[PDB]
């Protein structure tokens, strides 16, 4: 369980980045 | 227009979920080990 | 543009799942104290 | 407190299937 | 051309809402430790 | 740890309320 939950929140890190460098993208 | 956001933030609504569902199978493991101990004690 | 009112919704639902997992685990951290000191 | 967390977490995989849906339907 | 404020707003809220799950899962695995070392001390 | 996490779920109330007045904000 707990190798799994790491998995996922490294998953969340690197979508976070994603949606936020995403976001400034938009502010233009 | 935005849609490229929208299918990211959905994306992530989805990591988060799928974190805290594997979060409660491992908090519901601990509750039980818990009354375990405490019946032990009992 | 009508898809935000469901993503708001659905943080809103997730918080609040957060928040009863902190009770929860709030509530296992204090049961673990308890057994540590019997021991102690 | 194990009861309300599935009733809550049974929520939000609904709301994550409609928001899913949705966003298909904006085409992905 | 409107609600990239709210959008803001999610965005940041996915960084609480990781970050809050990312110091739960801190302390959750500090219980799971704690456990296992009373379930040491009666074996 | 908990106060940490405290903390958190705080700032995560305040911003949830701040979106859903900006939702509202959102019409004619």
């Known amino acids: ?28 | 227009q935005a849609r490229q956001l929208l299918s990211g933030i959905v994306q992530q609504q989805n990591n988060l979920l799928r974190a805290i569902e594997a979060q409660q199978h491992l908090l519901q493991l601990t509750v039980w080990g818990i009354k375990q101990l405490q019946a032990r004690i009992l």
């Open chain 1, 1 to 28: 369980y707990e190798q799994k939950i790491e998995e996922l929140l490294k998953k969340a890190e690197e979508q976070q980045k994603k949606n936020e460098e995403e976001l400034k993208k938009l502010e233009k």
